[PDB]
Amino acid sequence: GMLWDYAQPVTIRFGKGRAMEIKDIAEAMGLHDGIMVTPKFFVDSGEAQRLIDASDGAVSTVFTDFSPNPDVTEVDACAEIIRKNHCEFVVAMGGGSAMDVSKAAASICLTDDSIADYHGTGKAMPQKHLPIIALPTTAGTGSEVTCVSVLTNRKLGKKAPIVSDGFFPSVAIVDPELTYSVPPKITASTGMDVLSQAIEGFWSKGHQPICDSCAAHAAKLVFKYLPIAVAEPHNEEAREKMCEASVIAGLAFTLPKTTSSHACSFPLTNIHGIPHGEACGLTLDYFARINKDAQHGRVQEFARGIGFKDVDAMADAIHDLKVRIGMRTGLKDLNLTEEQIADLVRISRHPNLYNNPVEITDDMLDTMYHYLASTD
Amino acid sequence: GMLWDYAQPVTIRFGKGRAMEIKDIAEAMGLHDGIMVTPKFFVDSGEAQRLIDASDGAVSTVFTDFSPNPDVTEVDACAEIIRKNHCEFVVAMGGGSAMDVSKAAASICLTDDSIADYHGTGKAMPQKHLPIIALPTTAGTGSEVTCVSVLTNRKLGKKAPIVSDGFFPSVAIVDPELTYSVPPKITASTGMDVLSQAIEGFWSKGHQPICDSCAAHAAKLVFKYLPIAVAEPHNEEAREKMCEASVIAGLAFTLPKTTSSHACSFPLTNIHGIPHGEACGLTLDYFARINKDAQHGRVQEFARGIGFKDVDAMADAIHDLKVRIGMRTGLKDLNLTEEQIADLVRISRHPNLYNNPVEITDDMLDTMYHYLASTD
Ligand SMILES: NC(=O)c1ccc[n+]([C@@H]2O[C@H](COP(=O)([O-])OP(=O)(O)OC[C@H]3O[C@@H](n4cnc5c(N)ncnc54)[C@H](O)[C@@H]3O)[C@@H](O)[C@H]2O)c1
Ligand SMILES: NC(=O)c1ccc[n+]([C@@H]2O[C@H](COP(=O)([O-])OP(=O)(O)OC[C@H]3O[C@@H](n4cnc5c(N)ncnc54)[C@H](O)[C@@H]3O)[C@@H](O)[C@H]2O)c1
Known part of the structure; x- marks a missing residue:
């Protein structure tokens, strides 16, 4: 006998030049005012502003303050930005690090508790979360179809992943063009x-x-x-x-x-x-x-x-x-x-x-x- | 380059003897009082009641009035049954015929029109429906992981499929024990x-x-x-x-x-x-x-x-x-x-x-x- 379960609730859009279809997802889902968590490389290169202008006002704010090994403080920092601008969805345009804080911030910004209160301390993450549109730019970690968010606590020396059903991205646009600059x-x-x-x-x-x-x-x-x-x-x-x-x-x-x-x-x-x-x-x-x-x-x-x-x-x-x-x-x-x-x-x-x-x-x-x- | 979309929103619970887990899915979803759409063969063999008693009051009613090529009248007959007994979910235990009326009757019971009003004419189905737990008993057509519901209009002499995103079953339990009797x-x-x-x-x-x-x-x-x-x-x-x-x-x-x-x-x-x-x-x-x-x-x-x-x-x-x-x-x-x-x-x-x-x-x-x- 072979027993196994299979659950994969992430829609995948594959094709070159499909990163411009962010406006098609924010209109169909009826979501405005988004935050794009991307490394500063895409900000200075103009690639980040190119997609924001293509979304036609769907994305408003940008968050770029996070490390390749992301900390629990950058997650709450990103959560505070979402709390201020009243962001409805979260865009994750980056490698496995930009998508790690996007899953954690989208679930933690709906509570007044720090992200450390669930970082390997047995406390289950609240399943309520903002929608996520993962745009991987490295090939890769496959984090755009996982419910895992690997974080780090520098003040406490902790480094452990967080698995929650609310970390699954709704849509994951895999554009090979974004990997050309790697x-x-x-x-x-x-x-x-x-x-x-x-x-x-x-x-x-x-x-x-x-x-x-x-x-x-x-x-x-x-x-x-x-x-x-x-x-x-x-x-x-x-x-x-x-x-x-x-x-x-x-x-x-x-x-x-x-x-x-x-x-x-x-x-x-x-x-x-x-x-x-x-x-x-x-x-x-x-x-x-x-x-x-x-x-x-x-x-x-x-x-x-x-x-x-x-x-x-x-x-x-x-x-x-x-x-x-x-x-x-x-x-x-x-x-x-x-x-x-x-x-x-x-x-x-x-x-x-x-x-x-x-x-x-x-x-x-x-x-x-x-x-x-x-x-x- | 390659262009393709992938969307598989069905949860697959594969395993020998896992048909008893209807209680787990109904409890996890907090649902009770379900309608089991199954052919009459599984009722005469006691296999239907074995799962009704295993659900322990989660499933209450049974519908067995549908032909191998299902007619729209058999769907509305099942829909009106759910209206008269207010069931909270649908249990589709059967072949493709049983899993094609469970998709139509779960969405059309929330409305007052006939299921033939969307049969081949092109009118889109309402995206509001009851949860579907598909228990396929053949191997098979794979209707438990598709969104198509092949129907038939005998009075109009038409047999046209219906495709709706709301037809996707929530969980598809695949049990090889139900196929031993084929x-x-x-x-x-x-x-x-x-x-x-x-x-x-x-x-x-x-x-x-x-x-x-x-x-x-x-x-x-x-x-x-x-x-x-x-x-x-x-x-x-x-x-x-x-x-x-x-x-x-x-x-x-x-x-x-x-x-x-x-x-x-x-x-x-x-x-x-x-x-x-x-x-x-x-x-x-x-x-x-x-x-x-x-x-x-x-x-x-x-x-x-x-x-x-x-x-x-x-x-x-x-x-x-x-x-x-x-x-x-x-x-x-x-x-x-x-x-x-x-x-x-x-x-x-x-x-x-x-x-x-x-x-x-x-x-x-x-x-x-x-x-x-x-x-x-
Ligand atoms: N979340 C998960 O499920 C999962 C799985 C495995 C690993 N991880 C974690 O993810 C991280 C690895 O992610 P990675 O493997 O993508 O590297 P990464 O994104 O961590 O860092 C890659 C570096 O490449 C830089 N860069 C420069 N040009 C780039 C471009 N054009 N596109 C993308 N990045 C560019 C980025 O700024 C970044 O500093 C590790 O910390 C690993 O532990 C997470
Ligand atoms: N919706 C989809 O994705 C999809 C795909 C392919 C076919 N279909 C449709 O589904 C139907 C075919 O499904 P099928 O191939 O299961 O044909 P079918 O549905 O007739 O199989 C059911 C029949 O099998 C017989 N049977 C005898 N012992 C059985 C047992 N132990 N368990 C189950 N059935 C038993 C019964 O007569 C029962 O009516 C056709 O209408 C076909 O067009 C749908």
């Missing part, structure tokens, strides 16, 4: 994040068939088009394909969740400043050679479906992919101490690690990090 | 209906990547388990695997729509009484040999993705599948006249026919129908 180094990291969510989402203990079809489709696209997009940022086909894999791979991690590589990326990112997708890719092919034979050859069928002889052949491609696009293949330059390696193992015992098809023991993490700390 | 002949016909909507849904003109990932997963499951479900009606795994492919193929054809085998199946059913799934599969392999080199080798990559050397190897698998499960391979026993063959050509020119990649001219229809008239 630098090659970020394109490679965000591309590895798509590949990690696709592979981890498949071999997860909470897998389901609808997510597997999306996971296999997105993974094959990353192996083919991601090197092209890194080398050629203006390649319209390679960018559009990466957006295709990005939103589709997001549909494979919302329910089955992620496993080992995402559990190890949290210490590799927060402690050592390694970007998220690059930290996940740092251990992707490592756990692949471990889970290759689990689930009665199910992972072997995944590799053959995307065009590989075995899983070890697929793990070789993941390694050749990271080298060609300039991603980390080791941690020898960090000069990690035995205390730091032991810190990597203790913090890697995350709830996501238990979703791995093969039980990862502490002796395995100690072997992996000692191998990573001794590799260029 | 006779092998109906299993084979409904089984071919899944493979049709998957193959047609893939090579359609309005194809999109999310639906194509689902189309390949569903098609690969039918080739392996459909003969098992036919020769072994109580095979639990074969039944579950057919239920899995049926709901996944529902998401595959709801947006890209159907192509030629569905356009040719409508005259094969209303005039000659051939079941829908059997009438679709009667021409499915014929159009495959036409669309093999279409869309720049796209259908070729589809056949290799599911495990065939080419479409020709897949077309042979379709033929051998129908012979093993006892589906029509020709129309020689009908002894069709030259008038009848030309009558099938006229009616087969349906709007869904133009969705085929290769153009289906009237001469190709005349050639195909004359070929089937000479085939056993």
